[PDB]
Symmetry: C2
Subunit: 322 residues, 2 copies
């Protein structure tokens, strides 16, 4: 029925049914003094729906999230933050409808919450966390231009691939199939040092975090499964070589963050058409916004767990941006 909590010092606890009254989360351990309002959160929530009137037949409002506690005069107070989304199900106030869930909702509370972790890490450490689709069934995108990713509806970073992607889905929609997908999410500028071992390593906790996303059948950090093929060397005493900081570890070594960008990828499986018609076909490209929140949530928590461990902080000074 649930294991509705995730996180230890930055923890999120959620409740709520899609056929139910509303959704909710109580998010813990956010330092005081971070600027925060609904809109901050809603940009993250709405990103699950790419396009200014792209989809379906008619438009909805949609359904706005509210901060019930934990912020004062635009900034966090350090106390637990309450988040509410009163589901507006067409019935409030002999054939009036009901049955259950249309549930982008199952993801609302976590996305909203991540939006907070997300912001704090940008605000404080200048951490960028963004993801993008790299594969849709038999189509792959090989270039990455971040500016392009919000242009198309596949969260795709290769302008050349957007059409091939747009071609495929079009077919699958009217052919009636659905296909797998591969998303890569990156965390740029994560301070070295975060992650607790053996058991709660940053990767370990990221994997567990990402798997909470339905339909994922695989998580891999860095080079990932490619790794089984590879033959080992980082270091030998030699005259000429190709550098180490092409990440094979993807930002995490031995459980701890290394300071280099953190690269994660997830694989989502094909879904279903249950019965009018929206036919997904890859409804797994929508995961991206929420892939982003999971990574953020783990990241934020391990930040605190790491701060939690110290009297004063030893080097390094390095390029300082808040």
């Amino acid at each position: 029925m649930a294991g509705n909590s995730i996180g230890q010092l930055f923890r999120v606890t959620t409740c709520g049914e899609s056929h139910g009254v509303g959704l909710m989360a109580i998010v813990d351990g956010v330092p005081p003094g971070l600027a925060l309002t609904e809109e901050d959160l809603q940009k993250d929530l709405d990103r699950r729906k790419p396009g200014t009137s792209k989809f379906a037949t008619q438009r909805k409002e949609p359904d706005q999230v509210e901060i019930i506690s934990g912020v004062f005069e635009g900034k966090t107070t350090g106390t637990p933050i309450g988040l509410l989304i009163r589901n507006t199900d067409q019935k409030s106030k002999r054939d009036y409808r009901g049955g259950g869930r249309s549930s982008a909702r199952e993801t609302a509370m976590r996305v909203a919450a991540g939006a907070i972790a997300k912001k704090y890490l940008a605000e404080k450490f200048g951490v960028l966390i963004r993801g993008h689709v790299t594969q849709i069934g038999n189509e792959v995108a090989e270039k990455l231009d971040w500016n392009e990713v919000p242009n198309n509806p596949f969260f795709c970073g290769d302008v050349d691939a957007v059409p091939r992607f747009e071609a495929l889905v079009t077919s699958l929609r009217e052919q009636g199939t659905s296909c797998g997908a591969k998303l890569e999410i990156l965390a740029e500028k994560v301070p070295v040092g975060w992650g607790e071992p053996v058991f709660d390593r940053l990767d370990a906790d990221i994997a567990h975090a990402m798997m909470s996303i339905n339909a994922v059948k695989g998580v891999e950090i860095g080079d990932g499964f490619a790794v089984a093929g590879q033959f080992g060397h980082e270091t030998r005493d030699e005259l000429t070589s190709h550098g180490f900081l092409a990440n094979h570890a993807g930002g995490i070594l031995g459980g701890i963050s290394s300071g280099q960008t953190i690269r994660v990828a997830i694989a989502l499986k094909p879904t279903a058409s249950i019965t009018k018609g929206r036919h997904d076909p890859c409804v797994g490209v929508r995961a991206t916004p929420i892939a982003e929140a999971m990574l953020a949530i783990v990241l934020m928590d391990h930040f605190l767990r790491h701060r939690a461990q110290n009297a004063d902080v030893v080097p390094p000074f390095a390029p300082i941006e808040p």
Copy 2:
């Protein structure tokens, strides 16, 4: 430092350095009445370095685990089970002093703890948790004969692939290299129902544990990453077709167990090496992670069994036992 505990209802807490005095573990939630002794855990423990001798012609006896609590008269008392191993490192050329950090001691406590979950689950439900290697470097293994697996190092299940592994490893040693690895672990006869969504889905806790082993760079369940390129053409009517019941899900659907065998693969990377002494090379340590990968699967599954039972208040009834 540490994040030294894992499990919620079946919990393991550990400590200890390899160079250190010893290693400890307090294991929680194991029901009473389970037959248990040291050797029951040593078996699993010793499996880490395959073959009787088979490295350098001889064995000094490996360090020994000791149950320090939680069993009485050969049966679990249902209290927290404590485990110990006093390292016996030798300076060579009263046991002091440490400096020797061996990446093998690091896994003893999970494997030891894992053994308990594995044993209990085997009895109670018949559940077999077996790992086996499917790729070393650029060598694969398609056939799987479980009887094959313990008859060679590499935990490999394909007899005709064994020599190819040997080939590549005996070669590599020479060259001073090392290669990545791919391991598949299967848990059979696990009852439908375990797993707690949203955050604690079984697949999520398994991924989390698999990632505890050094060198793991990814975890996948069911078909895994291949899933990215598949098309879900399912009549979803079971109209005449092949593969109506095939474990594309690897035994976990929606985060809960499906009743089917649970299949999980992890991939370990080529390892680093140091010394200015020469002669021992891994050259593929990945393979030795198999019994560890097993323990982790069991730990997680054991914890989820108890969480499912706990969550259930109109339980199905079996009465096969009696007590004095």
